[PDB]
Design a protein around this ligand. Structure first.
Ligand SMILES: [Mg+2]
Ligand SMILES: [Mg+2]
Length: 238
C-alpha cells in the first residue's frame, strides 16, 4: 500500500464507528488500516467487529489488563510502535477512535508529499466542534513551516515519510516514547523527537475533525508542553 494509517482504540464504543468509517470511505483508497485495540470492553469490540470484514483492515488486540499493566507504559505509544514495525506503507499517518478524517484527507496529503520530495513531514489544519448544537468551534491552523510542533499540532493531523522513522530510532531507541511520564501529550513527545531532524510543512486545509460534548493515580508526574517547547527553542534548529 502507499499509506499505512495507524489507529489506536481503547474503550470508545460510542465514537469508534464514525472514526473507522471516515477512513474506509477515503477517496484515496490505497492504504492499510491498523486498528490497534488495547483489549477493550465488549461493547467497543462489538462496534469494531463488522469493520474487520474490510480487507484493508489489519486488526491487532492486546492482552493487557489491570492498573499495573495499563500504567507501565503510555499504552497508545506502545501500540503505535508495534504497528510501525509491521507497516508496509511509504507514508505513515495516525488516527484515533474519536477523530474523524475528512473525505479527501489522504488524497490531499499523499499528493503534497508526492509533489514535494524535499518535505518529509506535513500537517493540516484541524477543527473541533463543541456541542451543548454547536456552542463553539476551535481551529488549529496550518499556516507556517514549524520546527516546534509540540502542543501546536495534533496527533491526528500529520503524514510523514517512513524514512523519518529511521532517524528518530537511531537517536532515541524507539519511535514514539513509551515512557508513562508522556501519557497526556505523547503526540507532542513524538513530534519533539521528529523536530530534532525535520520541520513540519503546512497544508492549509481542515482535514480532520473532533467533537466534544485508579488509572490516573498510578501514572507518574506528567511532563508538559512548556518543557518540550523550551527544549526545542534551545536546540535551535530553526
Ligand atoms: Mg509503494
Ligand atoms: Mg492530545
Amino acid at each position: 500500500p502507499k499509506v499505512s494509517v495507524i489507529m489506536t482504540s481503547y474503550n470508545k464504543s460510542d465514537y469508534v464507528a464514525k472514526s473507522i468509517s471516515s477512513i474506509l470511505s477515503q477517496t484515496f483508497s490505497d492504504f492499510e488500516l491498523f486498528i490497534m485495540d488495547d483489549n477493550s470492553n465488549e461493547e467497543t469490540l462489538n462496534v469494531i467487529r463488522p469493520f474487520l470484514n474490510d480487507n484493508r483492515v489489519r486488526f491487532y488486540q492486546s492482552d493487557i489488563s489491570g492498573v499495573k499493566e495499563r500504567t507501565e507504559k503510555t499504552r497508545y505509544a506502545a501500540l503505535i510502535n508495534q504497528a510501525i514495525e509491521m507497516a508496509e506503507g511509504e507514508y505513515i499517518t495516525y488516527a484515533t477512535d474519536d477523530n474523524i478524517y475528512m473525505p479527501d484527507r489522504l488524497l490531499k496529503m499523499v499528493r503534497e508529499l508526492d509533489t514535494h520530495p524535499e518535505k518529509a513531514v506535513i500537517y493540516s489544519a484541524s477543527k473541533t466542534y463543541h456541542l451543548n448544537d454547536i456552542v463553539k468551534e476551535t481551529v488549529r491552523p496550518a499556516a507556517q513551516v514549524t520546527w516546534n510542533a509540540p502542543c501546536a499540532i495534533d496527533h491526528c493531523s500529520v503524514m510523514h515519510r517512513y524514512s523519518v522513522l529511521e532517524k528518530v530510532k537511531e537517536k532515541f531507541g524507539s519511535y514514539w516514547d513509551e515512557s508513562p511520564a508522556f501519557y497526556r501529550i505523547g503526540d507532542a513527545r513524538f513530534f519533539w523527537r521528529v523536530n530534532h531532524f525535520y520541520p513540519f510543512y503546512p497544508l492549509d486545509e481542515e482535514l480532520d475533525l473532533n467533537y466534544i460534548t485508579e488509572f490516573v493515580r498510578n501514572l507518574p508526574p506528567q511532563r508538559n508542553c512548556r518543557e518540550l517547547r523550551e527544549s526545542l527553542k534551545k536546540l535551535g534548529m530553526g
